[PDB]
């Protein structure tokens, strides 16, 4: 009675610098970034319990500032110039598990090599009714 399991959810992002000769005209974006929602390496895939993920972006991305991803991978790739707090809202398959908001501070590459680098990861434990 009142049984639960804990599962790890990791929100992270990677990015790469885009040199000027590879930038779209009148896009001020200096980077290509990707935010991901994954599980720990030591646990089963989160697709077993995650229904869908909403990514809330900074208003500069309007009218495309709310992006729904229903199937894995729960990845979102965009170009940009600025770091901002990404709100990731995780929805679970089992209705008994309420949605959670995770705020991930987007971290952009500063090596400027044009290679992809790891930016940041935000780790939370969630509770799943059993």
């Amino acid at each position: 009675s009142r049984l639960f399991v804990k599962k790890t959810i990791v929100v992270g992002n990677v990015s790469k610098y885009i040199p000027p000769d590879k930038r779209e005209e009148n896009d001020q974006s200096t980077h290509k970034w990707m935010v991901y929602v994954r599980g720990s390496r030591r646990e089963p895939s989160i697709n077993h319990f995650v229904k869908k993920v909403w990514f809330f972006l900074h208003p500069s991305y309007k009218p495309n500032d709310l992006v729904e991803v229903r199937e894995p991978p729960f990845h979102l790739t965009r170009r940009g110039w600025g770091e901002f707090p990404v709100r990731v809202q995780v929805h679970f398959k089992d209705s008994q598990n309420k949605r959670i908001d995770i705020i991930h501070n987007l971290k952009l590459d500063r090596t400027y090599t044009g290679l992809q680098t790891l930016g940041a990861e935000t780790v939370v434990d969630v509770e799943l009714h059993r």
Partner: peptide, 8 residues
């Protein structure tokens, strides 16, 4: 949440 970030 437990945050970790690369300096560069």
């Amino acid at each position: 949440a437990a945050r970790k970030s690369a300096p560069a």
